[PDB]
């Protein structure tokens, strides 16, 4: 029979899915972006076209909805699937330190591990302390003598005998104190060098342990 009303509707959809319709009807009549399809007066074997646009506002899971014309038994079953996952060539087996796998050119870390190469483990808060790799807001990293590893300074090694770079900001060492008689702090028989201050053994005094108690 001549079909004087073709309403295209869908059944109930989640919040996450929206559908609109353009109706290209046989009357020289077109409607755009409406919540249902609507054409008045379809002739015998004269086809009309609805364009259905479906948008998700997030990644949904496999599910289906149906579109039907009211009063007719035929049905369009619309299977919906997410298009959120990437399709990347990755390698199974460094350089996430065993605490992760690569995926699309970056490491994906296991539970209780962070950092680009999964080199750090999680604390209570870890990377927030990276301001605690700078002695103050406007200072360089670890006094230029260390690297920030997991929001904490790891000081550079030294080859110089008796020298160690230490401190929260690698700001200290065990050789830059005042000298006396050739050796730092008067040599090990008189005192010890710590962060520029000589710590004199019982018996000796002065900035470089040059004197005896008087």
């Amino acid at each position: 029979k001549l079909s004087s009303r073709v309403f295209l509707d869908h059944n109930a959809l989640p919040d996450t899915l929206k559908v609109t319709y353009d109706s290209f009807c046989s009357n020289g009549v077109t409607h755009r972006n409406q919540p249902r399809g609507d054409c008045d007066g379809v002739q015998i074997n004269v086809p009309i076209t609805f364009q259905v646009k479906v948008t998700a506002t997030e990644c949904i899971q496999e599910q289906s909805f149906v579109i039907r014309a009211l009063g007719f038994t035929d049905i369009v079953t619309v299977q919906v699937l997410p298009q959120c996952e990437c399709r990347c060539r990755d390698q199974s087996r460094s350089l996430c330190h065993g605490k992760g796998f690569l995926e699309c050119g970056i490491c994906r870390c296991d539970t209780g591990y962070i950092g680009k190469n999964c080199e750090c483990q999680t604390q209570g808060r870890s990377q927030e302390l990276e301001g605690s790799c700078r002695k103050d807001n406007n200072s360089i990293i670890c006094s230029g003598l260390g690297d920030c590893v997991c929001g904490q300074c790891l000081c550079h090694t030294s080859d110089v005998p008796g020298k160690l770079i230490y401190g929260q900001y690698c700001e200290c060492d065990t050789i830059n104190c005042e000298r006396y008689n050739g050796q730092v702090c008067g040599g090990p028989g008189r005192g010890l060098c710590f962060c520029g201050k000589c710590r004199c053994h019982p018996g000796f005094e002065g900035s470089a342990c040059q004197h005896h108690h008087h």
Binding site: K1, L2, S3, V6, L8, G37, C39, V42, I44, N45, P47, I48, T49, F50, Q51, V52, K53, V54, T55, A56, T57, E58, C59, I60, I67, R68, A69, F72, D74, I75, V76, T77, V78, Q79, V80, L81, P82, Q83, C84, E85, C86, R87, C88, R89, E103, C104, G105, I106, R108, K116
Partner: protein
Amino acid sequence: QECTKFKVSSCRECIESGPGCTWCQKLNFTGPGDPDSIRCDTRPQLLMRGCAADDIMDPTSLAETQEDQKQLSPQKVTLYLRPGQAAAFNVTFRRA
């Protein structure tokens, strides 16, 4: 086009942010100091930043006609929906 990346740490999180986002999968692309989110940008940004075309991940929504009786055609459709990107397909009505 348009891409905002707050807390983007993976390719998937990037694609989820919005339809104008794409992801550079080339290891070469990043240096020690850069955050992972620099891989997530519009196509033109990544391209003139040195990402090759064949390493830019950018999955798109599409309609797939699966099975195609009388008045409503097709009977079955499959849609892959990237968030914020419409998939479109046509339904033909017919009668006698």
